[PDB]
Design a protein around this ligand. Structure first.
Ligand SMILES: Nc1ncnc2c1ncn2[C@@H]1O[C@H](COP(=O)(O)O)[C@@H](O)[C@H]1O
Ligand SMILES: [Mg+2]
Length: 1334
């Protein structure tokens, strides 16, 4: 009855809150009980009382609607609709026996071992307290009294089990009386004792789970301190050890009763009583296990595997009684537990310090749930560990975040019934390596953490430590005073030195603005202000530029000294006057050709003075130059000419009827000179560099003169570039480092040494050109300079080279090591950062030397006038050392992409901090404000210094007629090659019209294989212990079901199948060799008596199928070449049964496999004139696509994960109108079924013939089923015009990609592998291609 139930709940709440019964009855039905000071510890008690009343509700059901009315309306359902909690408990377990560990004690125990991830430590709490005088004889009594009073305080831990001893062999109390000492010595010795015993691994293996102790300081001070391994205790149990030590010190007679409910009795009861909720929670965790977030991805100075004996460092902050009150009142007004305030505020900090906002944290629940009320006096480890996934919402108030985090935590509390350790174990077994190495422990009992009976004897908690193993950062909370001690037991040296302090200072700041300001304020933290202060300096670097047309300065340097050498090229030179005139003639020719201000002009000239004159001439016509290599291939050039909206192209070719009108630079050099460059305002489009672009369409990066010249000035004024300098422009014109050579170098009036197009990658030409023109300035991607430095110092003298710019790709840490002894005195290497989209660069790390902690040469300070943010995936700045997305900002940015406003809005984003490029580079601001770049998260990679989007390479391969989809990756090995992988499209058909005469087989052959199974198993089942239990259970039954029952025959079977007693003897012995040699399972495929294809090739009349599959190969009678391939080679063992008439005169035959080792076992025995080709790590080298007039599959199509795998592979491998020849098991071969059992791989793979045909016709091949039917069916099928070939791909790549990004090696898969998100597995494919490089 509902009113009687509200009375019962009122009485439970009046107990659990301690409020009066009448006052609690006066709470309204919708009045929030967390809004009255209910918390989770009380609510699990109330929920346990409801469970004990048979009124079964989950904690989450009560907790998602935490008010009396909602509880009553849940309960009016549950008292008739919900399951009874009735379980037959074990009423006792034998009290001295080595009983099982609780799940969280198993975690601590396994974490105690030296080998485990961040292991080798206790899990102990250490507590320190102060007082003037206390008696050691009271304390030595008190410690041994509490060891005898509570079973768990003397529990030995061995071998994954715990044993309550009679009395432990080792003392409970460490008296350290030092009233003898000098204070300074005792205080340092205290620090030595503190450091030892607060990190000490307690001797739990000898039942010392806890050790009290007391230093007596010569300053007249007793530092009572307490080491307790939480293997023995909940921190709630620890504060009861404190209460009892308090009474046992003060008045030991008042210790009421040794609390009777022994911990083995509790674990037996609790495990059985949780068991259905644990199985229900297990279903929930299994459905989430591939979807768990990881560890909080915090900035680690060391890998957690690599610090061998982790000291905890405590950080702590006593929130005042007033701060606590303000959190408690706001928490109540916002309907949340005080633990959810702290857990949410901590998860916001962890989110803000993580590379991802989704992570686990290990939340130790209280789990004191047993029927005897004295369980709340027992001292065992009643913790149970909740693996809280939390998934912190960015861009919300804290009120929204804490309610979300509470509903998440409260929702997860029932799912803690399956313990966090078994979740993580099941993750490790499922190949999900995950851990929850950040702990969160709310210990908020209002009596105080240190209980009254102990505070009356000793000072309130002076200090403490955790030592939780596997755990980086143990965040406890305690009531201390009636305030709240926040503690972060971070691990020493795991994090960067400033970080846990800085992160905790931001956590305290967060909790204080939660005391002191309403929760409608953002959950998204400020940075720790000092981090934002540093970064606002480094971003705030002043413009350091005069906003002007980009060409202005060169035309000034020309007007100021017309005779000075502007360009040096192929051992001739061009003056600034000559170049300015040549440019202004081009400009006049361009205005004559209808080009006009901020309209755009392609420049596509071989590297040399006419190119430089043309870009200056475009700019001096007022136009935006759109550089492309002359090597840029015609279809790609048409994508760019189309996308750029380009007015004109300059190309040495005259063609006024091209896509843009295309012009001879030599004719534009006949043009009248403009008397000046056209006046452009600084913001006009200056260069549009066509970077590679991920949809396949290349992308024009439209950079204003202001933007370009802000980078250039910021760097000219740093290099101190002057008229005596000369630059080697190894920069290609469509790679925007050239824009600095071009308008920086000549704007300062330094000369440009240009390589010829003949010298575009030629280190020896650069070395000659540098030593010949005494080049002072280098500028490149470091791939080009490492190439230049690979010439010896005797062959390539760079001592003229005053200063060096390295850019746009990873500088190796030893490149300044190679470079400083090679280049000039005053070497001035600068490594520069930032993308095409940001003007020519955006950072500068100078490198006089590399300090050893650089893992890469960082992006330095931002260049003057431009800036970096590093952001979370929600746009807010990440804290220092945290990885986030590099946003380049400020005056240097490109205006956008030339005609892609939507991709521009995706990249050039606007924020309260101005305009930002959102690069997709990852990186982190170090504590010194330097910006370590950390590579890229996305499909964009660097090939020979140049930028490539793998999405472009893939799209340029999908642009092949015949490709369904593609993958690309830059590969491992010293070659650093770009690879790619193809799925062909199959041109499907439906082809059920089939005309196989089925009649050749007879049932006596399946009976004969049954008799041979009776021979082989009848012998090996004299020694069935050679097998495993799966082989035994199958083969003992199959000795009827596949060998004799309903399959009678004589040993004439063997004479019908064709193998005789020497064969059977080798089958039995080779199988014993497979079993007992430890080579399982793969050695099945290395022996002609073992393998499913080798047995099939004679036993099921696979030889009479082979007599037809060995035919359709006309080459010797044709007098002419036939190209043939085999998919199902394995160790070659079926070809060995056709070999002489298989290996026909005139033939090309190629072996393929899907492993190396089996094909190499084929090459070890088959004649080496046959061509050998791995499909290494699944992967077909594309040099074989469309090559073969005949393709073979043989007694292994079942072994492909679909027929559609092998059939698409065959269809790709076949030349058009060439033929597949396919034989496979459809019916059981009883002996191939032994082999299937030894692979332990399903004989359900053996197709029906209609299904084989439907899959094959879906793979587009037109079939005829020929012969040999249900034992082994020979199908041929004939290839459509799939249109792929090696040379056709190479030609289509040569049409659509420059030689920078055509894959130097190319492959195919019948489908791409998916990672666990359902996206293409570019890491597995990068590895697979790397393995396929050999
Ligand atoms: N010093 C560098 N080290 C490594 N990568 C760099 C460096 N400088 C620039 N990059 C990055 O390389 C990426 C590819 O080059 P980009 O074509 O300009 O986009 C960009 O996102 C750049 O920020
Ligand atoms: Mg770029």
């Amino acid at each position: 009855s509902r009113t009687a139930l509200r009375d019962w709940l009122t009485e439970q709440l009046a107990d659990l809150l301690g409020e009066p019964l009448a006052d609690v009855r006066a709470l309204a039905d919708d009045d929030d009980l967390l809004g009255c000071g209910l918390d989770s510890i009380r609510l699990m008690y109330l929920q346990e009382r409801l469970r004990a009343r048979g009124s079964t509700l989950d904690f989450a059901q009560l907790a998602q609607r935490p008010c009396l009315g909602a509880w009553l309306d849940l309960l009016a359902c549950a008292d008739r609709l919900s399951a009874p909690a009735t379980v037959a408990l074990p009423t006792a377990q034998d009290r001295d026996q080595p009983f099982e560990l609780s799940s969280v004690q198993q975690a601590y125990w396994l974490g105690r071992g030296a080998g485990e991830v961040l292991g080798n430590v206790s899990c102990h709490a250490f507590l320190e307290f102060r007082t003037r005088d206390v008696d050691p004889q009271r304390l030595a009594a008190a410690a041994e009294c509490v060891r005898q009073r509570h079973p768990m305080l003397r529990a030995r831990f061995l071998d994954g089990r715990q044993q309550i001893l009679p009395t432990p062999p080792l003392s409970c109390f460490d008296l350290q009386d030092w009233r003898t000492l000098q204070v300074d010595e005792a205080e340092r010795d205290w620090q030595a004792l503190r450091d030892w015993r607060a990190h000490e691994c307690l001797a739990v293996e000898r039942g010392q789970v806890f050790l009290l102790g007391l230093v007596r300081m010569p300053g007249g001070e007793d530092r009572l301190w307490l080491s307790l391994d939480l293997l023995a205790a909940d921190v709630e149990s620890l504060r009861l050890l404190l209460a009892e030590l308090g009474v046992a010190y003060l008045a030991p007679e008042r210790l009421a009763e040794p609390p009777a409910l022994h911990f083995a009795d509790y674990l037996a009861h609790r495990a059985a009583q949780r068991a259905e909720a644990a199985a229900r929670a297990r279903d929930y965790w299994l459905e989430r296990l591939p979807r768990l977030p990881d560890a909080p991805a915090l900035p680690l100075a060391c890998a957690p595997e690599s610090i061998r004996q982790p000291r905890t460092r405590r950080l702590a902050f006593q929130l005042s009684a007033g701060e606590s009150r303000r959190l408690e009142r706001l928490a109540a007004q916002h309907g949340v537990t005080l633990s959810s305030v702290f857990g949410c505020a901590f998860a916001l900090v962890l989110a803000r310090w993580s590379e991802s906002a989704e992570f686990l944290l290990n939340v130790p629940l209280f789990d004191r749930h047993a029927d005897d009320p004295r369980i709340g006096e027992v001292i065992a480890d009643f913790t149970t560990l909740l693996l809280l996934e939390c998934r912190m919402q960015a861009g919300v108030s804290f009120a929204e975040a804490v309610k979300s985090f509470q509903r998440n935590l409260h929702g997860a509390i029932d799912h803690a019934a399956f313990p966090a350790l078994e979740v993580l174990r099941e993750a490790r077994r499922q190949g999900q390596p995950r851990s929850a190495p950040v702990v969160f422990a709310s210990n908020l009992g209002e009596e105080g953490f240190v209980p009254a009976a102990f505070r009356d004897a000793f000072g309130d908690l002076h200090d403490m430590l955790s030592q939780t193993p596997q755990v980086w950062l143990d965040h406890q909370l305690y009531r201390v005073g009636d305030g709240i001690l926040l503690a972060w037991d971070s691990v020493v040296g795991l994090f960067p030195e400033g970080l846990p302090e800085t992160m905790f200072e931001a956590y305290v700041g967060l909790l204080q603005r939660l005391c002191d300001s309403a929760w409608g304020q953002p959950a998204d933290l400020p940075l720790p202000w000092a981090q934002q202060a540093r970064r606002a300096l480094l971003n705030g670097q002043p413009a350091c530029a005069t906003a002007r047309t980009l060409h202005r300065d060169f035309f000034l340097r020309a007007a100021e000294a017309p005779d000075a050498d502007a360009l040096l090229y192929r051992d001739q030179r061009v003056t600034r006057g000559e170049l300015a005139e040549r440019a202004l003639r081009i400009a006049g020719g361009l205005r004559e050709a209808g080009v006009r201000p901020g309209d755009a002009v392609e420049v596509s000239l071989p590297r040399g003075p006419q190119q430089v004159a043309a870009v200056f001439g475009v700019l001096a016509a007022g136009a935006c130059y759109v550089p492309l290599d002359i090597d840029q291939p015609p279809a790609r050039r048409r994508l760019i000419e189309e996308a750029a909206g380009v007015c004109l192209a300059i190309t040495e070719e005259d063609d006024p009827q091209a896509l843009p009108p295309r012009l001879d630079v030599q004719r534009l050099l006949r043009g009248p000179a403009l008397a000046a460059p056209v006046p452009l305002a600084p913001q006009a489009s200056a260069y549009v560099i066509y970077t590679s672009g991920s949809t396949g369409v290349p992308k024009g990066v439209e950079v204003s003169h202001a933007a370009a010249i802000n980078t250039i000035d910021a760097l000219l004024d740093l290099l101190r570039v002057n008229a005596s300098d000369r630059l080697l422009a190894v920069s290609a014109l469509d790679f925007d480092l050239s824009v600095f050579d071009l308008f920086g170098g000549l704007g300062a009036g330094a000369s440009l040494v240009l390589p010829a197009q003949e010298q575009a990658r030629d280190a020896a030409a650069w070395a000659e050109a540098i030593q010949r023109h005494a080049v002072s300035l280098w500028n490149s991607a470091p791939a080009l300079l490492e190439m230049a430095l690979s010439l010896p110092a005797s062959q390539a003298d760079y001592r003229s080279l005053r200063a060096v710019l390295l850019s746009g790709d990873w500088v190796a840490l030893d490149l300044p090591g190679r470079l400083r002894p090679r280049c000039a005195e005053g070497c001035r290497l600068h490594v520069l950062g930032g993308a095409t989209e940001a003007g020519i660069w955006s950072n500068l790390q100078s490198v006089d030397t590399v300090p050893p902690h650089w893992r890469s040469i960082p992006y330095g300070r931002p260049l003057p006038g431009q800036a970096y943010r590093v952001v979370d995936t929600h746009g807010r700045d990440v804290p220092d050392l945290v990885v986030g997305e590099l946003w380049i900002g400020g005056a240097s940015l490109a205006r956008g992409y030339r005609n892609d406003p939507e991709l521009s809005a995706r990249r050039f984003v606007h924020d309260a901090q101005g305009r930002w490029y959102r690069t997709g580079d990852r990186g982190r601001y170090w504590g010194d404000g330097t910006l370590e770049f950390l590579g890229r998260v996305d499909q964009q990679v660097k090939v020979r210094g140049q930028r490539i989007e793998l999405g472009e390479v893939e799209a340029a391969l999908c642009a092949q007629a015949g490709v369904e989809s593609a993958c690309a990756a830059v590969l491992g090995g010293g070659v650093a090659s770009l690879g790619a992988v193809l799925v062909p499209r199959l041109a499907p058909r439906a082809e059920g019209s089939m005309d196989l005469p089925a009649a050749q087989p007879f049932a006596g052959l399946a009976e004969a294989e049954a008799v041979l199974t009776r021979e082989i198993l009848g012998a090996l089942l004299e020694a069935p212990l050679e097998l495993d239990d799966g082989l035994r259970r199958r083969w003992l039954d199959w000795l009827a079901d596949s060998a004799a029952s309903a399959l009678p025959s004589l040993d004439e079977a063997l004479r019908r199948l064709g193998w005789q007693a020497a064969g059977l003897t080798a089958m039995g012995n080779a199988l014993r060799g497979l079993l007992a040699g430890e080579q399982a399972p793969a050695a099945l495929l290395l022996d002609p008596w073992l393998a499913p294809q080798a047995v099939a090739a004679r036993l099921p009349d696979g030889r009479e199928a082979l007599a037809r599959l060995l035919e359709a190969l006309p080459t010797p009678a044709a007098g002419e070449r036939l190209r043939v391939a085999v998919l199902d080679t394995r160790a070659g063992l079926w070809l060995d049964q056709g070999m002489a008439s298989l290996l026909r005169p005139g033939l090309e035959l190629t072996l393929f496999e899907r492993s190396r080792v089996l094909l190499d076992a084929a090459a070890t025995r088959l004649p080496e004139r046959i061509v050998v080709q791995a499909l290494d790590d699944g992967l077909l080298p594309a040099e074989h696509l469309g090559r073969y007039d005949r393709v073979i599959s043989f007694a292994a199509l079942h072994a492909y994960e679909a027929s559609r795998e092998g059939l698409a592979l065959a269809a790709a491998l076949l030349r058009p109108q060439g033929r597949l020849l396919l034989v496979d098991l459809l019916c059981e071969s009883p002996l191939a079924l032994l082999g299937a059992a030894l692979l332990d791989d399903r004989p359900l793979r053996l197709a029906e013939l209609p299904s084989l045909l439907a899959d094959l016709a879906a793979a587009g091949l037109a079939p005829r089923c020929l012969w040999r039917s249900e034992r082994i069916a020979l199908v041929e099928a004939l290839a459509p015009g799939l249109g792929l070939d090696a040379a056709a791909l190479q030609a289509g790549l040569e049409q659509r990609l420059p030689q920078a990004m055509r894959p130097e090696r190319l492959w195919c898969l019948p489908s791409l592998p998916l990672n666990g998100n359902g996206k293409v597995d570019r890491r597995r494919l990068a590895e697979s291609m790397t393995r396929a490089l050999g």
